[PDB]
Design a protein around this ligand. Structure first.
Ligand SMILES: *[C@@H]1O[C@H](CO)[C@@H](O[C@@H]2O[C@H](CO)[C@@H](O)[C@H](O)[C@H]2NC(C)=O)[C@H](O[C@@H]2O[C@@H](C)[C@@H](O)[C@@H](O)[C@@H]2O)[C@H]1NC(C)=O
Ligand SMILES: *[C@@H]1O[C@H](CO)[C@@H](O[C@@H]2O[C@H](CO)[C@@H](O)[C@H](O)[C@H]2NC(C)=O)[C@H](O[C@@H]2O[C@@H](C)[C@@H](O)[C@@H](O)[C@@H]2O)[C@H]1NC(C)=O
Ligand SMILES: *[C@@H]1O[C@H](CO)[C@@H](O[C@@H]2O[C@H](CO)[C@@H](O)[C@H](O)[C@H]2NC(C)=O)[C@H](O[C@@H]2O[C@@H](C)[C@@H](O)[C@@H](O)[C@@H]2O)[C@H]1NC(C)=O
Ligand SMILES: *[C@@H]1O[C@H](CO)[C@@H](O[C@@H]2O[C@H](CO)[C@@H](O)[C@H](O)[C@H]2NC(C)=O)[C@H](O[C@@H]2O[C@@H](C)[C@@H](O)[C@@H](O)[C@@H]2O)[C@H]1NC(C)=O
Ligand SMILES: *[C@@H]1O[C@H](CO)[C@@H](O[C@@H]2O[C@H](CO)[C@@H](O)[C@H](O)[C@H]2NC(C)=O)[C@H](O[C@@H]2O[C@@H](C)[C@@H](O)[C@@H](O)[C@@H]2O)[C@H]1NC(C)=O
Ligand SMILES: *[C@@H]1O[C@H](CO)[C@@H](O[C@@H]2O[C@H](CO)[C@@H](O)[C@H](O)[C@H]2NC(C)=O)[C@H](O[C@@H]2O[C@@H](C)[C@@H](O)[C@@H](O)[C@@H]2O)[C@H]1NC(C)=O
Ligand SMILES: *[C@@H]1O[C@H](CO)[C@@H](O)[C@H](O[C@@H]2O[C@@H](C)[C@@H](O)[C@@H](O)[C@@H]2O)[C@H]1NC(C)=O
Ligand SMILES: *[C@@H]1O[C@H](CO)[C@@H](O)[C@H](O)[C@H]1NC(C)=O
Ligand SMILES: *[C@@H]1O[C@H](CO)[C@@H](O)[C@H](O)[C@H]1NC(C)=O
Ligand SMILES: *[C@@H]1O[C@H](CO)[C@@H](O)[C@H](O)[C@H]1NC(C)=O
Ligand SMILES: *[C@@H]1O[C@H](CO)[C@@H](O)[C@H](O)[C@H]1NC(C)=O
Ligand SMILES: *[C@@H]1O[C@H](CO)[C@@H](O)[C@H](O)[C@H]1NC(C)=O
Ligand SMILES: *[C@@H]1O[C@H](CO)[C@@H](O)[C@H](O)[C@H]1NC(C)=O
Ligand SMILES: [Fe+3]
Ligand SMILES: [Fe+3]
Ligand SMILES: [Fe+3]
Ligand SMILES: [Fe+3]
Ligand SMILES: [Zn+2]
Ligand SMILES: [Zn+2]
Ligand SMILES: [Zn+2]
Ligand SMILES: [Zn+2]
Lengths: 425, 426, 423, 426
């Protein structure tokens, strides 16, 4: 049944004025937080890729110059896509920025994160598999209405679900951009590529994976010496965030494998104590839907996560919520019969948070009974919050669409694996 | 430690004459055997990409037109690389072909396979991780001197090992091309991409995986509707051969995953009864080196191989030889504890054959004791032959470098999984 | 102002899902055994395959071509197809179909006879056509001609889309649909004029000839040219040389180099008629664009006389003119030799850029009429160059205001190689 | 006949050190002189495209990041070409810069021109058709030893003459770069494209006009809103310099035509009194060699030069020296018989200065007798100096290779067409 919001919905309204910038969105633009990638689309003509910005502190207006690009997908032709990086921003300060400098100007703002450090607090939103259904809209409202006040969204993939439409009707990317603007124009969303971003459709000569997503959503991948936008790293406040690609190559020797190996080695827990991994497809999942799809990546990387004491791994893909115990399944050797997950205080917690709404369908069927490795699971629409207090403590909470915005249906304290490895079960 | 043949070795000699074609090699150019891709390099000037060819019978000389390309890698600049496809050939006939039409002509020949069919005999050589060491030269000689007489080489990856040299010195691609010539200019080699072809080197700003390899070695990947040179299939005689890429994406919904799922559905066992899979990294491997590297691909494809009753999966990567029992390990569901390989008459035999020589090192360390799923393993240099007799029987043998060219240190009868699914254990 | 409106019948869209539109053809090789088929699909990419067969018997074959797209400012093109059909039979009628996947449309052309000394043929002359009502009239007159044109030599300025805001490239699409009724059935030989340049740095479009060069291909490699803007073809008893007024032609440049070499290749005993096409006239006694042709004239005029070009057709000036056979090639800065003289080795220069443009005629002329000008008139119309045999060609000019059979100006061309009599 | 310096001449020496930058050259990088384009080649590996620079004043060392490129020409493959722009410099300041930051660093310096202004003095060298013959070397020496101290070279085209070699042996581009380094590394040379830069060679599939030149020599063309490296404008001191392309399109409506029309409108003689035009092919020329080749461009632009009262037009192409009277020939209407040049105080002086050496041949055949429009002409090798004193006066001198470096064989004072419009005839 169609639960996608109609094209004439209020959330899809086009900003008025000739060549008004639309689908405005921002993300972190460098490794440590001093830069911001500003992106938007113009529909009437190319327009200018310049961004005007200034801090509240200094009130000196400056100009950053960017780049415009376009793409085609089957018989769709995109508008004019702008990406511009503002650099050398001051930490912990409010900036205003304007786009559409030539015809119709629109102004927004954001706050740069504090400089990275050991005890620096920060609140991350967790959103997965958002889509553009009425549920999607409710989750977005709950997030923006949260008393916890999220400062940056960690997005675990499956953005627009445009690919569910005939020929992937790319108009549905445009609507998604206009819908999400109310949040992502004012705070960065950290992008992870899910399977709905693949858009491999050889039947209509579209054979370059991630094409629409990769034209529309840029990431600071060169900042961490990644050679691809689909895996990369950022540091923000006290968190070191590693973004992975479930649908890229990760065999031994491949670019993603090589990069992750080196990146984990570069992590300094005395500088960013919170080590967080994002990926679309969950390594631990006890739901019927996509059961065991995460197995391949798990066999490659799980031992690295345990060895480097990753604090937490976030994923989506399953349209529900699940939180694992700290467990590992890394003792297997084909013939030794050691294929059962065991408690391991050195392993991350695996959280599945792909329940922001998608196209309005929840994954309710669960493998019964709940396995030992699963601490909490529930088939409900909602979003998460990962609220870092200091180097030892972070509080995670899950909020359900059917609950008040201030209500936590699940919550748990994370004790840091490097600085405070006490049983946080 | 350096057991690579020196640059001035006889196998590396440059063919004489102004702009003489060198590094000549061919491979199947289409889905069923009526085409051939002809490839070669000219060093002095671009030269012609035209190929003259004719059957020894008829003798009507024809011209095929191809394309020239070049590439750079760090401070290396390639010579001029030619790829030309000859099409609409007659089955089971000898053709002569010539390259260097403008200046120094060189002439070679090949024999097209018989048309695909249920009971068409054919002999495949199996060579993996060849490299260019003295051991490499020995393995090649054994293959070309085999009384079995291989008609096509299935190459399971790791070609030149140029990436071991400073800045991957691509000269060592050129030397490997000239060293091969004696063989792959007269019979096709079916290429699989190994980890030594990846050549991911961001430290010298070379970040495109498979670049040198993909410029030098073309495969007929569009013929099987693949969107990439790194996975594809061909039919030859009674065999349907599926080539996979261990070092490309294979997650659910990815191009390779999607392609393979569809491709298996196209397999017709009444026309090609022998279903053969090539990949670089072994799904079953009981050597310590690279132990369990194949697990990721195994979780994705193993159940598929059993479902479609693949006869045999060949791989290289580990520098040794191994032959599994017919087993499967596809019953695991995380908490059911079903994680031990069991005997499964629907499953392929897995053979590791990455011992053609590489840079002169063997992998001798093995998991002890030998696991139940492992039938035979030995750390020696060599190559295999897969000799199809008919729709029910194929004979596989492994020849060691230290033995006479006619000695099989291991040998086994494959009973076809579709036409004759009887226990063929050893 | 005078341009036909978007809802005009001539701009009508062929019905049916992804129906091929803007179909046009042109010679695809050096001597006539090939044809370039071009068209546009708007609904989706579609197939670039062309099905074709000869009326006689007719085994159906398929030729596969290429699809392309482009952007110009805020305009995005449809899916443009170009496909070459090769190895055709001479002097035979062929049918061809495009849009094989969804909506097929069928057309036809007739290949020319093999090239030869005495092979007859009739060429239409059309320049600066545009899409005004005048334009539509000219096209009608040409197609209703009793003399029956078999190929159009087009001397430049096609759609005049560059007159619209941001060169509204939709106006290229309409011109394509407009001209289809003629150019889908017989080749037009394309010359590049100044309205094809489309140099518009103010909207970041700085590649000359961009839209023109995507929509209209020419067989330039067939004569070893390295550019579509200059090339030659042979058809029946004619050798036709197409030059580019708005490309470089300095000594040593590609075009200059190619022309010098191309003239050495002309064989008057295979193709006695040597025809040159260019947009901007070397001889012109109208005020508009007076003397714009001088630069090219100083470079190529002596060559045209040396190789005894029969006739040079140009457009650009929106009127009709025919010169005497004169040359002005003796000037040496200080020697006072700067007047054109009768020269029986020289071509006749014909200005024929009066097919309609955007509805405006150039009527202001230099007075009195110079010696070198034989005939000139400010009327809309088109020409016909009718080759009878190696000695005689008949050229005529038809005015839009006359009956389709009426020739306001008419002249016999006596071949410069086989019959160099004063005409 | 071969008078080109041999490959092992001292002037072609390779700078010592691994990956040592060579063929270093600089030119103005912006409209008004606050920028500089730094160019160099590395032969061993790509290297860094970063330039380190600081003023003799403070400094305050800074880095500018550039770009690397390469090309092939037939069977030639280039080294790694770096172009890096340094911006926001101080006027009238000596700067040091270094290239080759990663392995072998080399250090140079330049002096930024003073801010543009009415009476700003400045000395331009004029060199055309240099080549790499022994004569070429003598001319460069005379320029650098000149008592007048050239501060910037206006170069009227025909650089290396590499195209005279077999397949245009591009190695002769590398030699010419090493030879000219001793001057162009320390002061900008302002490039004009000549016929020897076209390098149209279809017979060897090189069909892109100016390819090697355009890769090796960059100009700040976007600063004057040109859309091509081949025509562009700069201001330097009291001069506004317009560079044109004899071998690009210039018909009505073409990019160069449109650009030049608009550029002349932008000229302000109240800010830059000296209006100078550079082009390769002379509009006025009384030598037999290339007689009247300039006629095509003359017909297009001559009237514009008169209309805007250009002070002086410099050209090369003809291998000799010539200086015209102020003449115009713009009244011709085909039939009216007005086709003789006449004295026109509103017109530029036309100077032919393509006598720096080429491949060792001088053009000595002149049309006799000397025409009225020609003031002075002589067939000797040499170079010119255009020495601006203030808004009204500029001194032009011509120095011959057979004379002392201090001797002026031809000499004339220019009266500025805007600020001192009085007959300056000799
Ligand atoms: C979008 O903004 C442009 C300026 O950033 C407008 O161009 C300008 O229009 C002005 C009218 O107030 C005019 O004086 C300026 O010269 C001109 N500036 C330019 C072209 O750089 C543009 O206005 C439209 O386009 C111009 C060229 C004219 O056609 C106007 O009549 C148009 O309104 C703005 N576009 C629109 C559609 O608003
Ligand atoms: C790091 O953050 C923790 C979570 O906010 C701090 O714990 C909290 O400390 C409060 C007193 O400052 C106390 O009222 C709260 O109950 C407590 N929260 C929890 C969930 O335990 C933590 O404070 C230290 O450790 C706690 C357990 C107490 O021992 C405090 O006295 C300590 O200050 C913060 N650590 C530091 C070094 O501040
Ligand atoms: C396929 O090839 C096999 C090996 O060439 C055939 O088996 C062999 O038959 C020989 C006489 O033809 C016999 O002496 C060999 O012992 C035997 N070889 C082996 C390894 O079994 C096979 O022939 C059929 O099946 C075998 C088991 C016997 O029953 C034969 O009599 C059969 O013809 C060949 N199969 C077919 C269908 O051609
Ligand atoms: C791109 O191709 C689509 C078909 O593959 C177009 O949709 C089809 O339009 C048909 C009428 O031409 C209509 O009957 C079909 O229902 C429809 N097919 C599907 C699967 O939706 C699409 O057309 C645009 O949108 C449709 C719904 C109509 O409004 C058309 O008039 C529109 O052009 C094509 N899109 C574009 C931008 O061309
Ligand atoms: C080429 O075609 C010309 C035009 O038809 C021929 O001239 C015409 O010949 C007619 C006899 O068939 C004659 O009545 C006409 O007067 C004449 N038309 C013109 C415009 O002159 C021409 O015939 C040759 O040359 C002319 C001058 C006469 O000498 C004829 O007798 C000749 O046959 C044709 N030339 C050739 C080579 O056939
Ligand atoms: C502009 O530069 C001219 C060339 O240098 C100056 O002329 C020269 O002035 C010298 C002393 O200043 C004098 O000895 C030279 O003969 C003379 N050179 C020439 C070629 O005339 C010029 O100076 C002005 O005009 C000259 C003729 C003298 O009358 C000076 O006294 C004047 O100042 C310079 N103009 C200015 C305003 O400085
Ligand atoms: C155009 O031709 C192609 C190829 O023959 C057809 O597949 C199209 O059919 C349409 O799209 C397919 C995928 C299927 O949905 C069918 O029912 C549709 O009719 C055809 N396109 C149209 C619009 O006719
Ligand atoms: C392009 O721009 C013009 C305004 O300059 C606008 O009026 C026109 O409709 C636009 N065309 C498009 C967006 O296709
Ligand atoms: C989406 O949510 C916003 C904020 O709650 C609300 O104002 C708007 O009406 C909603 N739109 C739809 C279509 O649900
Ligand atoms: C390689 O083997 C070949 C064939 O046996 C032999 O001719 C040659 O000498 C060998 N070359 C080297 C370097 O071993
Ligand atoms: C290029 O070709 C010429 C012959 O055409 C040859 O003599 C020369 O050595 C070659 N140069 C290189 C480096 O290939
Ligand atoms: C154009 O000309 C054709 C042919 O005479 C005629 O049928 C058509 O109606 C005309 N259209 C317009 C709008 O002039
Ligand atoms: C070039 O001139 C310089 C300076 O006069 C001199 O030192 C050098 O030897 C000359 N080189 C030649 C003539 O090859
Ligand atoms: Fe999802
Ligand atoms: Fe190996
Ligand atoms: Fe016109
Ligand atoms: Fe010269
Ligand atoms: Zn998903
Ligand atoms: Zn390997
Ligand atoms: Zn015109
Ligand atoms: Zn010259």
């Amino acid at each position: 049944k169609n639960r996608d919001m109609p094209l004439d919905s209020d959330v899809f309204r086009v900003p008025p004025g000739y060549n008004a910038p639309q689908q405005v969105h921002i993300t972190q633009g460098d490794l440590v937080g001093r830069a911001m990638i500003i992106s938007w689309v113009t529909m009437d003509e190319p327009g200018s890729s310049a961004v005007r910005y200034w801090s509240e502190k200094n009130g000196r207006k400056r100009i950053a110059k960017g780049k415009m690009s376009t793409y085609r997908f089957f018989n769709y032709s995109s508008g004019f896509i702008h990406h511009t990086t503002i650099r050398k921003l001051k930490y912990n300060t409010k900036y205003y920025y304007e786009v559409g400098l030539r015809n119709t100007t629109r102004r927004f703002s954001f706050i740069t994160p504090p400089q990275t450090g050991l005890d620096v607090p920060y609140t991350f939103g967790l959103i997965g598999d958002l889509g553009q259904s009425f549920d999607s809209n409710t989750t977005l409202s709950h997030y923006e209405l949260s008393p916890k006040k999220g400062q940056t969204v960690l997005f675990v993939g499956d953005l627009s679900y445009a690919d569910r439409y005939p020929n992937h009707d790319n108009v549905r990317w445009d609507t998604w951009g206009r819908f999400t603007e109310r949040s992502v124009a004012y705070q960065p969303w950290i992008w992870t590529a899910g399977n709905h971003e693949i858009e491999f459709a050889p039947e209509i000569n579209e054979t370059e994976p991630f094409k629409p997503f990769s034209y529309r959503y840029h990431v600071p991948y060169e900042a961490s010496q990644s050679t691809s936008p689909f895996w990369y790293s950022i540091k923000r406040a006290s968190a070191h965030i590693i973004v992975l690609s479930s649908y890229s190559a990760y065999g031994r020797g491949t670019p993603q494998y090589t990069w992750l190996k080196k990146e984990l080695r570069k992590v300094k827990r005395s500088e960013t104590p919170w080590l967080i991994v994002l990926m679309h497809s969950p390594l631990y999942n006890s739901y019927n839907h996509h059961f065991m799809e995460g197995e391949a990546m798990r066999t490659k990387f799980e031992a690295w996560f345990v060895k480097y004491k990753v604090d937490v791994v976030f994923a989506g893909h399953v349209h529900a919520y699940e939180r694992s115990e700290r467990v590992s399944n890394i003792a297997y050797k084909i013939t030794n019969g050691l294929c059962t997950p065991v408690k391991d205080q050195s392993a991350p917690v695996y959280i599945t948070i792909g329940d922001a709404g998608n196209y309005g369908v929840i994954d309710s069927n669960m493998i019964q009974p709940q396995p030992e490795y699963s601490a909490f699971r529930e088939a409900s629409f909602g979003h998460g919050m990962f609220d870092i207090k200091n180097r030892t403590h972070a509080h995670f909470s899950w909020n359900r669409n059917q609950d008040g915005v201030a209500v936590e249906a699940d919550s748990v304290w994370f004790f840091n694996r490097h600085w405070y490895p006490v049983d946080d079960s």
